[PDB]
Paper text:
The highly conserved eukaryotic Elongator complex performs specific chemical modifications on wobble base uridines of tRNAs, which are essential for proteome stability and homeostasis. Here, we report the structures of the fully assembled yeast Elongator and the Elp123 sub‐complex solved by an integrative structure determination approach showing that two copies of the Elp1, Elp2, and Elp3 subunits form a two‐lobed scaffold, which binds Elp456 asymmetrically. The eukaryotic Elongator complex has been associated with a plethora of cellular activities 8, 9, 10, but nowadays, it is widely accepted that the main cellular function of the Elongator complex is the formation of 5‐methoxycarbonylmethyl‐uridine (mcm5U), 5‐methoxycarbonylmethyl‐2‐thio‐uridine (mcm5s2U), and 5‐carbamoylmethyl‐uridine (ncm5U) in the wobble base position of 11 eukaryotic tRNAs 10.
A difference map between the full Elp123 model and the asymmetric model rendered, apart from a minor difference in the bottom part, a bean‐shaped density. The orientation of Elp2 in the wing of the map is restrained by crosslinks from the N‐terminal WD40 domain of Elp2 to Elp1‐CTD and the N‐terminus of Elp3. Elp2 is located peripherally attached to Elp1‐CTD and Elp3. In detail, the active site of Elp3 is located in the conserved cavity formed by Elp3, the N‐terminal WD40 domain of Elp2, and the α‐solenoid domain of Elp1‐CTD. The region of Elp2 contributing to the cavity includes residues 201–204, which were found to be important for tRNA modification activity of Elongator. Finally, to understand the contribution of individual conserved surface residues in Elp2, we mutated residues in the previously identified 30 basic region (R626, R628, R654, R675), which was described to be important for histone acetylation and microtubule binding. Although we show that mutating the residues of this patch (R626, R628, R654, R675) affects Elongator's activity, it is not involved in protein–protein interactions within the Elp123 sub‐complex.
Residue numbers in the entry: 3 to 241, 255 to 325, 339 to 483, 533 to 788
Write the structure that this text describes.
């Protein structure tokens, strides 16, 4: 019936220009994979990322809000620049795609009706939007003819009406200042006027400050030489030592001069944010330092008034709310850290957002269905759960989801996870090893307090997730040099089934381990196939389903006394292409399993004793793209079964299936689905708040939660 995007967990890209914040709305927009994630940093219920803007075909690199407007500019490694416009108070849509560039866009800077673009081929362009429509047209572009120079940062400043400055920093030790004038349908008098020198390495961040005092404002530059330089700009009323004068025209005379030097002892300068209207400077560095610099009240020299954090920080943001001011910054794990201060004196850390930075490979709910696990190539296993209760046992108005634990942070290329119990899980990958972990005492009391799972003031901070909420490894299992591809637990939680793929010599094999003694049950299952893509124990544990890349499926009958297996059913032409995923249906529906294949079809297989004893094809359904994930809900909804279907391009479908007929409940709106391959779909056993819950992992970089309302 009704579908809600409950939660989106996606990590922030690691570039210095990826993030920005709307001055009026306080909405944080940052590049996250191919998408632009939107975060309300001060939502009353602590909601994290609530939407991801799709469109770019490669990693988003720059994001900037057009000041005093409803527009937003973004850039990507796809060489494109996109113009977005607000449709409601919180969401935007793409209105223009600039395909003028051949290499990655590196820097952006925006002012009302103006955009400054920097490309990795050396091009610097000025775009101003037409007045009739909202389309942005190329006004003029040029190049700094200094070898293979290309810009790494840009900053615009409106000096007077129709007259602008453009700061350029990149692969050069000098800050280039250009000046142009606004004219009918473009610009003129655009040339480089000054080369502010002083830095000793590449300039990585630039930012002009606004004119609180008419005609006298500041420009801060950050370099890879660990320093920040402050430059004073004046107009008409100007005067070692140096000062770079130039004329924007026969009636405007600018004078720039060095004013202050800061830091120099905390690695590269990652990001610099001025604050409106106070005269303070926020700086993020590459050694995980976030500092506020302001001129002393007595001596006037610049001095650090606040220090936060300690790796590295890439971007930082700054907004004021309720007489306090908030500091944002993203780290190596793609997580946003946040602080709040009455004043530069006191502060406390506020709840942030988190997510993977590389493709999400697998997910798995706990047997109870109260939390979700997800692994990523970013070498982390992450646990997400809803914040249902406050500290007093009262139920929160909205149960927003958060990462409550990071069981693993140093896992080499995991591609599969599965929960043994509510307190233990197993994980594997190309390590050629299978690791199992227990739920520690700390995480326990936290899930019990805020999530209600029975067995501080708010969910964890990034500090606690990186080195306190790790699960202790309890068991090492060796595949004897064979890479793992997937696994499953028997319903009784007494058996592991590990799928190991072929080394192009020996074929695939299924290894069975006991959860009690963690010893292999030695009759290993061989194959005439190379890569098993998914194993699944039947609901009653009687059979072990198998699907392979070479288009086959095979059912292994279980001996309930010896815990051994014997091939009983097989099919060598059930599908035309790779079978990516399979899942059983509730026994109350029958003896049924479903397959999903690269051949774009989902097929249902029901057991029949009639001639012959075998699982035969019952129904099929074709799609537009390859089907990569499928999940049947543990319970039955409206006397039928509920099937979620994930495609290679990110689309998700929800079906109700009865004997011989599929029924499209709905295709999830294109604005809430992932932007790439769904790697796993998993319903949650739990029914809560009259809602079913669906967990999704994708090459998006994201782990997403959806709800479905039935009764």
């Amino acid at each position: 019936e009704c579908i809600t995007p409950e939660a989106i967990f996606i990590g922030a890209n690691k570039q210095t220009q990826v993030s920005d914040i709307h001055k009026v709305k306080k909405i944080v927009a940052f590049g996250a994979g191919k998408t632009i994630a939107l975060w309300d940093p001060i939502e009353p219920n602590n909601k994290g990322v609530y939407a991801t803007l799709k469109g770019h075909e490669a990693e988003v690199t720059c994001v900037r809000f057009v000041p005093d407007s409803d527009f937003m500019v973004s850039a990507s490694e796809d060489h494109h620049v996109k113009i977005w416009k607000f449709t409601d108070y919180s969401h935007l849509q793409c209105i223009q795609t600039i395909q003028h560039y051949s290499k990655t866009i590196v820097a952006l800077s925006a002012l009302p009706s103006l955009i400054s673009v920097g490309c990795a081929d050396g091009t610097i362009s000025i775009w101003r939007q037409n007045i009739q429509n909202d389309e942005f047209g190329l006004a003029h572009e040029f190049t700094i003819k200094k070898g293979f120079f290309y810009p790494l940062c840009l900053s615009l400043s409106k000096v007077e009406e129709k007259k602008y400055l453009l700061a350029i920093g990149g692969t050069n030790v000098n800050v280039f200042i250009a000046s142009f004038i606004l004219s009918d349908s473009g610009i003129e008098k655009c040339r480089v006027v000054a080369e502010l020198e002083g830095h000793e390495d590449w300039v990585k961040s630039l930012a002009f400050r606004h004119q609180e005092t008419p005609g006298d404002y500041l420009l801060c530059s950050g370099s890879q030489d660990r320093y920040i330089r402050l430059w004073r700009i004046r107009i008409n009323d100007l005067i070692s030592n140096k000062q770079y004068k130039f004329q924007i025209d026969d009636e405007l005379r600018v004078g720039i001069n060095f004013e202050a030097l800061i830091m120099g002892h905390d690695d590269w300068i990652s990001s610099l944010q001025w604050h409106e209207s106070r005269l303070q400077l926020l700086a993020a560095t590459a050694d995980t330092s976030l500092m506020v610099w302001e001129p002393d009240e007595t001596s006037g020299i610049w001095v650090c008034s606040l220090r936060l954090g300690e790796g590295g920080f890439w971007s930082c943001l700054w907004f004021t709310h309720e007489r306090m001011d908030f500091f944002l910054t993203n780290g190596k794990t793609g997580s946003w850290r946040m602080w709040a201060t009455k004043d530069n004196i006191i502060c406390d850390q506020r709840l942030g957002i988190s997510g993977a930075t590389k493709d999400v490979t697998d997910i798995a709910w706990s047997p109870s269905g109260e939390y979700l696990l997800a692994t990523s190539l970013d070498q982390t296993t992450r646990l997400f759960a809803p914040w249902i209760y406050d500290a007093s046992g009262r139920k929160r108005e909205i149960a927003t989801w958060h990462e409550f634990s990071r069981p693993q942070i140093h896992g080499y290329d995991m591609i599969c996870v599965e929960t043994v119990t509510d307190t233990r899980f197993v994980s594997g990958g190309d390590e050629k090893i299978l690791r199992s972990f227990d739920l520690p005492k700390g995480v326990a009391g936290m899930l019990q307090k805020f999530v209600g799972i029975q067995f501080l003031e708010c969910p964890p901070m990034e500090d606690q997730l990186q080195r306190h909420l790790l699960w202790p490894e309890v068991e090492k299992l060796y595949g004897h040099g064979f890479e793992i591809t997937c696994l499953d637990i028997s319903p009784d939680q007494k058996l592991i089934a590990s799928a190991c793929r072929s080394n192009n010599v020996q074929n695939a094999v299924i290894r069975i381990f006991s959860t009690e003694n963690w010893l292999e049950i030695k009759p290993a299952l061989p194959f005439h196939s190379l890569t098993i893509t998914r194993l699944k124990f039947s609901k009653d544990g009687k059979f072990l389903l198998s699907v392979c890349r070479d288009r086959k499926w095979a059912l292994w009958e279980r001996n309930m006394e010896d815990n051994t297996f014997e091939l009983r059913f097989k099919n060598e032409k059930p599908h035309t292409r790779i079978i990516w995923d399979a899942d059983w249906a509730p026994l109350e529906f029958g003896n049924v399993f479903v397959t999903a294949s690269r051949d774009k079809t989902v097929k249902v297989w029901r057991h029949q004793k009639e001639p012959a004893d075998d699982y035969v094809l019952e129904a099929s359904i074709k799609h537009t793209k390859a089907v990569t994930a499928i999940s049947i809900h543990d319970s039955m909804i409206r006397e039928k079964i509920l099937i979620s279907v994930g495609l290679e391009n990110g689309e998700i479908y929800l079906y109700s299936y009865t004997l011989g007929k599929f029924e499209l409940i709905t295709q999830l709106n294109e604005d809430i689905t992932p932007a790439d391959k769904i790697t796993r779909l998993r319903w949650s056993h739990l029914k809560r708040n009259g809602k079913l819950f669906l967990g999704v992992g994708s090459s998006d970089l994201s782990t997403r939660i959806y709800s479905l309302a039935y009764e």
